[PDB]
Amino acid sequence: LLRCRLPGGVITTKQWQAIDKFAGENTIYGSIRLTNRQTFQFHGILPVHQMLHSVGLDALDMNRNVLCTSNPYESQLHAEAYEWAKKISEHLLPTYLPRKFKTTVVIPPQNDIDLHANDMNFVAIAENGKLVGFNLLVGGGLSIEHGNKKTYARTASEFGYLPLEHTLAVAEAVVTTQRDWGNRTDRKNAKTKYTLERVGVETFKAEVERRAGIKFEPIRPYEFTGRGDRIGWVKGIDDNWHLTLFIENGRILDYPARPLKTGLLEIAKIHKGDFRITANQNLIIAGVPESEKAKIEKIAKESGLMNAVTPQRENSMACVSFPTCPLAMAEAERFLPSFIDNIDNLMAKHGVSDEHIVMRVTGCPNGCGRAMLAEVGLVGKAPGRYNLHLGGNRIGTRIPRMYKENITEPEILASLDELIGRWAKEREAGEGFGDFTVRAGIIRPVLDPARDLWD
């Protein structure tokens, strides 16, 4: 189990060839696994620090990888936002945190980084194509304990707006308040989401302003329209293009007839710019001169990196789980493909094959696969059994309530077949499945997680 500090998921082609070699000759699995926190993992490491440090990479400290929207519609905004994600990352590097701390830099209208699963969030605010500040959202966290109503997933709370110059002092202030006010006794209550609920958002906020040496201004408008990656070619700035490759489960391995790993090595060798690991476990070959599109595209196409999948598969995600995770209760990564094969059939059957439902499977309640922010979330309870949650939304600002408990795939399928059926026929124009289950009364919404997540 090795993981890199790779703020924003940006990794160079030189660094890629380095992790490609190691994965292939120094691990049991021989794969590169892209995670949903924009970094990679090796599985079955049989020194890695030298191999990493040589290409200017390092393994992480309760601070996890700082995320940054990978492919903003306003392509010019990435450079600055990424610069800030990298600054915050080095600035937060070693104080001890009671529990781990997760941070992101979001570029609206995209919430691909899933900000509500994190402790500290900086929503970029730009004027005239220039970043002028950030709206600070604090307190997200998805981890729960089965049957423990004292634990809960919570969404981030808005603190206010801050000029760009106050970024680092604000980041440090949230970290330190949390550290000092974190529950000293129990670790399962040491998360920021718990502290906020204990002391209150305004109380925590006031302390943060006090320590930062600032006063938050009112939140500046921002909205999100989605969380998915922009699969395929999208036009960037100047004459450059970005090809985002869909990688199922983010598992990069050479499969028979689908040399995904070799393909990425090949592309890495001729690629101008760099790669960007997305929060959806995909990979962006970034900054391809228009003149190179055909080269890059030929390789990706031949390697099976560009095989078309349904929009459903592109918006589905699962955590690692078995065989490498020790906390795994049920399959996640290894269950998703055939499970989505079934969901695909179901989407076809109802005439919604062009639609998608943000569907996630987390191997255990720790919540790594972010099922607690999905429209349809599966939380492993035991081998082959999951709790089925429903009612989240496409943009990821609502926690889905438990709908069915400790059920098997055949039972999960039967339930979705019926629900998807009702959605395909009764939904309003452009209405997502999640919002639909809530509107149709299939599931009560979770309006205040700390108080109404559990029935």
Ligand code: SRM
């Ligand atoms: C790889 C990944 C899932 C995936 O398929 O993408 C994953 C994998 C693991 N996570 Fe995670 N988590 C992953 C994203 C997250 C997320 C989602 C996110 O951050 O966007 C969450 C939910 C949000 C949250 O933290 O509230 C998450 C919450 C946890 C927790 C529960 C934390 C808590 O507050 O209780 C644990 C267990 C722990 O550390 O307490 C954990 C533990 C683990 C470990 C490291 C198991 C361990 O403790 O030894 C898992 C390693 C499995 C393996 O064999 O590789 N992981 N984990 C992601 C790696 C992130 C990274 O590179 O830093």
Ligand code: SF4
């Ligand atoms: S959610 Fe559970 S099973 Fe999945 S990777 Fe995280 S700790 Fe392991």
Ligand SMILES: O=N[O-]
């Ligand atoms: O890697 N789990 O936070």
Ligand code: NA
């Ligand atoms: Na993926």
